[PDB]
Amino acid sequence: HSHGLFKKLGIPGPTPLPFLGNILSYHKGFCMFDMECHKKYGKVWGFYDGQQPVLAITDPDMIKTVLVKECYSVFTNRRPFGPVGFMKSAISIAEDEEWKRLRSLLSPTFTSGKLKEMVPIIAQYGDVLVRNLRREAETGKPVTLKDVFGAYSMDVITSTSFGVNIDSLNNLDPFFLSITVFPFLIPILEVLNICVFPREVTNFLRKSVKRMKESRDFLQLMIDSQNSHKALSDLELVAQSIIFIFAGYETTSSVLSFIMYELATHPDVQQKLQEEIDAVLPNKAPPTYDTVLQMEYLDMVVNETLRLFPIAMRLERVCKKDVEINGMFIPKGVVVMIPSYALHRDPKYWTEPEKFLPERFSKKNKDNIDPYIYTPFGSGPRNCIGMRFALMNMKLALIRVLQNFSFKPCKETQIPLKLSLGGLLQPEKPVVLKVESR
Amino acid sequence: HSHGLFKKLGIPGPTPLPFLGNILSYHKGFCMFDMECHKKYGKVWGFYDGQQPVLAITDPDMIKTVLVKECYSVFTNRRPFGPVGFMKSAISIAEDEEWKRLRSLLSPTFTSGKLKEMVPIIAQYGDVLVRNLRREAETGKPVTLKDVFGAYSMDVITSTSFGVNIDSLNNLDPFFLSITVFPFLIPILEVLNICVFPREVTNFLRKSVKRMKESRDFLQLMIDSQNSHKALSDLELVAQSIIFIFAGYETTSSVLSFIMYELATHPDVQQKLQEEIDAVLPNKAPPTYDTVLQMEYLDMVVNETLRLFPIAMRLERVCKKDVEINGMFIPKGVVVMIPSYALHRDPKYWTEPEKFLPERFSKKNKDNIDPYIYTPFGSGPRNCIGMRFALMNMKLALIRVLQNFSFKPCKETQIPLKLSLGGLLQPEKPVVLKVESR
Numbered sequence: 001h002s003h004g005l006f007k008k009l010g011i012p013g014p015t016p017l018p019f020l021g022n023i024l025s026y027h028k029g030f031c032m033f034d035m036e037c038h039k040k041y042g043k044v045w046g047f048y049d050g051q052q053p054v055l056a057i058t059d060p061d062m063i064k065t066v067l068v069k070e071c072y073s074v075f076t077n078r079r080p081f082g083p084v085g086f087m088k089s090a091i092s093i094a095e096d097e098e099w100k101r102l103r104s105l106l107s108p109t110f111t112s113g114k115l116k117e118m119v120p121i122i123a124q125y126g127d128v129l130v131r132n133l134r135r136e137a138e139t140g141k142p143v144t145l146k147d148v149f150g151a152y153s154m155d156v157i158t159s160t161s162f163g164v165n166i167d168s169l170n171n172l173d174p175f176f177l178s179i180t181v182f183p184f185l186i187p188i189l190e191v192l193n194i195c196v197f198p199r200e201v202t203n204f205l206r207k208s209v210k211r212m213k214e215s216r217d218f219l220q221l222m223i224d225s226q227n228s229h230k231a232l233s234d235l236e237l238v239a240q241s242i243i244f245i246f247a248g249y250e251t252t253s254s255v256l257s258f259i260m261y262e263l264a265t266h267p268d269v270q271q272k273l274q275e276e277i278d279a280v281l282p283n284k285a286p287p288t289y290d291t292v293l294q295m296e297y298l299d300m301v302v303n304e305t306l307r308l309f310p311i312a313m314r315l316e317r318v319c320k321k322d323v324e325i326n327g328m329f330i331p332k333g334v335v336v337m338i339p340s341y342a343l344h345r346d347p348k349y350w351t352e353p354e355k356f357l358p359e360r361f362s363k364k365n366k367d368n369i370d371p372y373i374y375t376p377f378g379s380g381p382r383n384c385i386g387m388r389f390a391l392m393n394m395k396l397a398l399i400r401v402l403q404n405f406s407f408k409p410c411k412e413t414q415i416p417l418k419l420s421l422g423g424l425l426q427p428e429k430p431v432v433l434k435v436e437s438r
Numbered sequence: 439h440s441h442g443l444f445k446k447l448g449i450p451g452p453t454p455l456p457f458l459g460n461i462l463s464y465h466k467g468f469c470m471f472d473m474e475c476h477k478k479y480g481k482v483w484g485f486y487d488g489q490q491p492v493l494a495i496t497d498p499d500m501i502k503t504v505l506v507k508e509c510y511s512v513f514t515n516r517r518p519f520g521p522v523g524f525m526k527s528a529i530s531i532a533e534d535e536e537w538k539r540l541r542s543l544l545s546p547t548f549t550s551g552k553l554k555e556m557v558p559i560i561a562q563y564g565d566v567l568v569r570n571l572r573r574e575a576e577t578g579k580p581v582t583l584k585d586v587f588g589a590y591s592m593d594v595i596t597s598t599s600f601g602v603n604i605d606s607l608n609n610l611d612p613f614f615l616s617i618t619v620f621p622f623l624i625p626i627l628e629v630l631n632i633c634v635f636p637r638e639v640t641n642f643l644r645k646s647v648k649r650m651k652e653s654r655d656f657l658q659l660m661i662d663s664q665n666s667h668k669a670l671s672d673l674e675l676v677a678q679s680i681i682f683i684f685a686g687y688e689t690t691s692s693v694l695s696f697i698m699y700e701l702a703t704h705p706d707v708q709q710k711l712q713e714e715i716d717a718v719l720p721n722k723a724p725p726t727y728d729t730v731l732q733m734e735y736l737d738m739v740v741n742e743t744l745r746l747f748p749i750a751m752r753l754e755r756v757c758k759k760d761v762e763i764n765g766m767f768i769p770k771g772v773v774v775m776i777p778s779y780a781l782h783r784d785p786k787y788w789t790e791p792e793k794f795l796p797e798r799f800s801k802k803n804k805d806n807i808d809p810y811i812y813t814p815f816g817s818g819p820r821n822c823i824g825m826r827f828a829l830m831n832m833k834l835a836l837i838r839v840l841q842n843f844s845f846k847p848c849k850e851t852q853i854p855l856k857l858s859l860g861g862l863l864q865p866e867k868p869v870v871l872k873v874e875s876r
């Protein structure tokens with residue numbers, strides 16, 4: 001029934017099926033479907049997640065309007081995700097004024113100053129990562145990257161969020177598809193006390209927090225925060241910590257795997273990066289905060305990897321009122337979507353876009369890139385609150401790992417890398433590479 | 439789970455049962471439960487329709503704050519009623535800016551000027567009401583009032599809304615209880631294309647409207663309206679007409695029955711009213727617009743009946759943001775309720791409140807009544823848009839009916855009147871009275 005909307009608005013798009021919309025086109029993933037629609041339709045098109053109208057926009061002025069200019073007024077919130085339980089109080093899920101408050105209380109936590117104070121604790125677990133890598137390098141047995149990296153990613157998380165310090169390494173799915181064909185079942189589950197975050201994990205940390213709270217990182221800065229608006233609660237403080245672990249876990253690890261695959265399949269870039277790391281940090285010097293920002297080619301590698309593998313795939317905002325933006329009428333309730341992956345690989349902006357070419361982000365060419373076409377961390381008042389931390393975290397990992405080791409493909413290394421057909425931006429097969437000691 | 443809210447806020451109220459809240463206390467009706475809570479708790483108290491927190495307020499300053507001062511900002515909408523289908527576009531159901539637009543387009547329809555132009559068409563069907571009454575008066579067979587009145591109420595509706603002219607007389611229930619224990623099933627039904635307004639009635643009028651629309655009252659003024667904002671649609675125009683029929687049907691008839699019962703059980707008031715009607719309209723003169731407003735004692739009878747029988751029972755607003763009003767913090771999502779029936783019978787404001795005493799509204803005493811304690815039509819920007827029309831409609835009915843007939847109780851007349859234990863403000867048994875010709 002709601003499938004007449006875009007037709008009335010005269011916006012092109014694939015014809016929807018009843019009770020499914022256009023969801024059957026997700027068989028090749030969000031990304032392939034985004035690019036095919038970008039090609040066949042042009043600057044704007046609509047489709048239907050079930051009965052939910054989604055409007056893709058690709059014009060950077062319109063993207064700036066949505067993500068920045070009209071954020072507070074119209075496009076404040078992401079599409080209603082649930083069932084979430086108490087995790088409704090987490091910042092990336094909260095809406096309107098509740099989010100606007102949580103953002104203010106959590107923004108000073110992620111300042112450049114606090115991040116610098118976090119570097120030495122991040123610095124220690126690289127040595128763990130190095131020695132755990134050196135144990136597998138002596139063996140030579142080819143390495144699955146998501147393990148060794150995911151262990152390191154966990155080491156940073158538990159340390160940077162709760163002062164807990166562990167050697168972790170030594171110590172489009174069925175449901176969410178059913179969500180968009182039966183989103184009238186979200187409130188069904190909120191009264192059923194079900195949660196996509198098992199009622200045990202949240203229970204574990206909810207009481208684990210109040211142990212550390214009353215026995216005495218992010219938890220510190222957050223506890224210091226609740227010392228205008230209305231300060232911070234105790235259940236809310238737990239929810240944010242959970243959203244920080246989830247955030248920094250499968251993102252820090254996934255990107256670092258994407259980088260090692262790209263460095264291995266481009267040994268020249270690996271050498272030029274190893275040259276820059278050795279020059280600024282002679283004798284495998286311990287990386288510091290300021291030296292990390294000093295390395296431009298390392299930043300060029302990171303951004304180029306994030307261009308080919310934007311973990312988020314898309315950016316979304318719920319249109320809370322009828323609005324006109326840059327000549328286009330958009331009705332209330334519509335989900336406006338910015339196809340990040342499809343823009344990061346648009347030939348109309350990127351020369352040879354399928355190729356890993358760090359020199360696009362050279363200090364010369366970094367000026368030609370539109371910040372509303374390249375958006376690995378989103379943009380506007382509701383961008384990645386942990387952008388600077390994530391970049392610092394990953395760069396500190398790459399530096400110490402390239403001071404000691406070089407990485408070579410193995411016969412099992414999936415060349416070229418095929419992405420996961422599911423709802424996650426991940427490789428089909430895990431990245432397996434050879435680790436050689438310098 | 440949501441049952442901890444008021445406890446935290448320190449607001450008193452009945453202790454709720456799981457998965458039911460306090461709904462089992464509706465066995466004696468909304469009204470009896472409201473008065474019992476007013477007595478036992480005082481100025482403010484909360485309770486739970488299932489998991490839904492409802493906050494009753496009784497302080498007129500707070501009532502003015504909710505209904506008037508903070509209407510546009512915070513308390514714009516009534517509690518989400520559904521499943522409604524396309525009737526979501528009807529004004530009494532619409533929310534926020536959509537309602538604010540529908541109100542503007544429909545406000546000039548209900549001006550005092552247009553109402554005066556509607557009187558002669560309303561005047562004609564009183565003669566129908568009189569002659570249909572005279573046929574039953576010759577017989578004398580005691581009369582059930584909701585029939586004869588409901589027929590007249592229909593005659594006004596179809597005439598005042600579509601120019602259709604008929605002699606109609608000659609031509610807390612199970613579901614909504616399940617609504618508040620399973621309100622997570624409202625979106626379940628919106629996708630099931632079910633409706634509490636059968637898919638045939640709405641279908642009947644939706645196509646019946648476009649017949650009269652393309653062949654060529656309220657429909658006229660509305661059609662003239664769609665000739666800023668965005669004008670009016672065709673489906674929306676039908677929805678409003680349906681909400682006008684529903685409005686003016688069981689309300690015009692229910693109140694007029696409540697008035698005849700009260701006039702019959704108080705023959706003195708009936709005589710003093712018949713005296714005023716004869717004096718201003720000698721020789722049973724045809725009532726005019728201006729003469730109706732000239733009659734003060736008739737207005738006193740109407741208001742006093744509406745004090746004892748406020749059809750709406752309660753007034754409700756959904757609190758769309760966290761707010762403080764007159765020293766009381768109110769969290770988001772709470773339903774703020776104004777117990778009209780319980781305030782209209784509060785002895786702390788009304789001397790001998792159970793008694794039918796029109797002299798409370800005498801030009802002398804009408805000054806002492808607080809318009810935030812007496813609210814038969816609500817108050818503020820979202821009051822009864824059809825207040826003036828309804829009063830004019832009912833007064834024109836009473837005048838011509840009292841110029842010709844007098845009304846006496848019968849042995850079957852339920853003295854005293856017992857109200858319906860359900861969710862409607864209606865009598866237990868229908869009102870049966872004796873009709874004598876003057």
Ligand code: HEM
Binds near residue numbers: 383
């Ligand atoms: C490579 C690493 C990361 C990438 C590429 C990334 C990217 C993004 C993107 C695209 C968004 C959505 C922006 C928008 O919708 O406009 C976002 C939001 C967010 N990110 Fe990240 N992120 C990364 C790491 C992190 C880390 C380490 C944290 C640690 C707390 C974090 C916390 C958040 C939060 C809380 C939000 C939601 C903010 C809000 O809703 O106000 N992210 N991120």
Ligand code: HEM
Binds near residue numbers: 749
């Ligand atoms: C004895 C007759 C009537 C009584 C006692 C009455 C009373 C009320 C009350 C108490 C409200 C709610 C006010 C609030 O929540 O603040 C209301 C709203 C409303 N009434 Fe009436 N009413 C009567 C007749 C009518 C008639 C004849 C119409 C014809 C159109 C009508 C149309 C409406 C509408 C559309 C609303 C909702 C307005 C909005 O939501 O913006 N009513 N009425």
Ligand SMILES: O=C(CNC(=O)C(F)(F)F)N[C@H](CS[C@H](Cc1ccccc1)C(=O)NCCc1cccnc1)Cc1ccccc1
Binds near residue numbers: 246248
């Ligand atoms: O789009 C999708 C897929 N499918 C659907 O949602 C639909 F239901 F439709 F099927 N997932 C997300 C929205 S939930 C995501 C999971 C989460 C985890 C713990 C607690 C609560 C919630 C969350 O909120 N934070 C993650 C932290 C992060 C990760 C990466 C970068 N920065 C921060 C989209 C998203 C991505 C990035 C930022 C914000 C939102």
Ligand SMILES: O=C(CNC(=O)C(F)(F)F)N[C@H](CS[C@H](Cc1ccccc1)C(=O)NCCc1cccnc1)Cc1ccccc1
Binds near residue numbers: 520525689
């Ligand atoms: O409260 C309750 C009972 N129970 C519950 O709602 C809960 F779901 F919770 F169980 N019903 C109403 C809210 S629906 C009511 C029905 C209706 C009819 C046709 C099309 C759509 C909707 C409507 O909207 N208009 C009526 C027109 C009117 C009648 C009388 C005076 N003026 C106007 C409360 C209400 C009363 C008065 C004005 C506004 C709202």
